[PDB]
C-alpha cells in the first residue's frame, strides 16, 4: 500500500535538459494510473509492448521513470527505433522497449517572455548513443576538416545547443515535459503492482 511517488516524477520542481536526462527508480510500491489516465494535461500517452487499458492490472519486476524537456515537434522521437537529434544524440530507447511515454505542454512553466535559453540538447556527436546511454560531456566537436584543439571556431562547436523557449513560439517549438516509464519484466517477484 506504499503508493509510488508519481507526484514527484510528474510534478517535480525541476526538470532536466534532455542531454542530462534524469532517471528515478520506482519499486516496492503500488502504482495507480488513475491520476495518469485522468490527466487531461497529457498530450501523449503511448505504450509499447503493453496495453494502457491493462496497466492497473499488471505487475513488473522494476520500473524506471526517465524525465526531461524537449520541444513539441520532437516528442515523436521518444519511441523505439526513432531517428533524429534527440533519438540519436540525447535519449535512445531500445529497439525492443516495453513501457509508456507520457508528454505534456509545459509552456507555462518552462517558457519566459524574451526566452528561456537554459534547456539544452546535444546537437553534435561523433556516434549515436546506445539505448539508455547518458552523455553529459562537453568537448568541442570537429565539424570541419581542421582539428579544433579544444577551441571553438567556425567549424568547431560546443556540442550542446539551447532551445529558445518563449510563449509565442508555435507548439512544435514550445517546451514539453516527458516521462518515460520502462517496464522490465524479469523472472522474479514483482515489486511494482497496480491496485
Amino acid at each position: 500500500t506504499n503508493l509510488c511517488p508519481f507526484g514527484e516524477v510528474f510534478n517535480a520542481t525541476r526538470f532536466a535538459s534532455v542531454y542530462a536526462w534524469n532517471r528515478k527508480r520506482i519499486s516496492n510500491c503500488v502504482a495507480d494510473y488513475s491520476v495518469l489516465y485522468n490527466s487531461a494535461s497529457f498530450s501523449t500517452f503511448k505504450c509499447y509492448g503493453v496495453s494502457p487499458t491493462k496497466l492497473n492490472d499488471l505487475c513488473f519486476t522494476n520500473v524506471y521513470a526517465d524525465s526531461f524537456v524537449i520541444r513539441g515537434d520532437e516528442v515523436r522521437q521518444i519511441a523505439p527505433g526513432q531517428t533524429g537529434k534527440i533519438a540519436d544524440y540525447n535519449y535512445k530507447l531500445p529497439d525492443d522497449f516495453t513501457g509508456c511515454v507520457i508528454a505534456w505542454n509545459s509552456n507555462n512553466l518552462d517558457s519566459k517572455v524574451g526566452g528561456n535559453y537554459n534547456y539544452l540538447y546535444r546537437l553534435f556527436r561523433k556516434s549515436n548513443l546506445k539505448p539508455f546511454e547518458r552523455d553529459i560531456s562537453t568537448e568541442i566537436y570537429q565539424a570541419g576538416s581542421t582539428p579544433c584543439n579544444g577551441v571553438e571556431g567556425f567549424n568547431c562547436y560546443f556540442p550542446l545547443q539551447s532551445y529558445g523557449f518563449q510563449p509565442t513560439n508555435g507548439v512544435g517549438y514550445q517546451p514539453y515535459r516527458v516521462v518515460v516509464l520502462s517496464f522490465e519484466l524479469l523472472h522474479a517477484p514483482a515489486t511494482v503492482c497496480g491496485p
Partner: nanobody
Amino acid sequence: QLVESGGGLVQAGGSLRLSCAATGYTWSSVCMGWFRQAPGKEREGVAGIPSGRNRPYYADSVKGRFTISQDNAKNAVFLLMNSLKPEDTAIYYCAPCSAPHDPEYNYWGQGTQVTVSS
C-alpha cells in the same frame, strides 16, 4: 524573429557597427555569430562569440579590424567594424554559431547590407 541593422555605405578605411537582436530559436545561449555573403560567393563566417569557456574568434581577413560583442540581457550581438575594405562589401547575417551545420536551422534573417566604396 530577428532584426539585423546598422549596415550602410562607408568610405574605405571607415567604420560601421552592426547590431542584431534575436529571440527564440534565432538566439543561442551557447554561441552567437556574424556571417556574411558577398554577391556570387557563399556565406562565410566573420566572427563568433562563445558565451563562456572560450574567447571570440574571427575570420582571418578581419582579425584586428572587427570586434564582436554581446549583451545577454537584451539578446543582442554587435559587430564593430573598423578600417573597412571594399571587399568587406556583403550582406551580413547574425545567427547561432552552429547554424551552418544544423540541418534544422531555417531561420536565417534578411541581413543588413554593408557597402564599401572604392
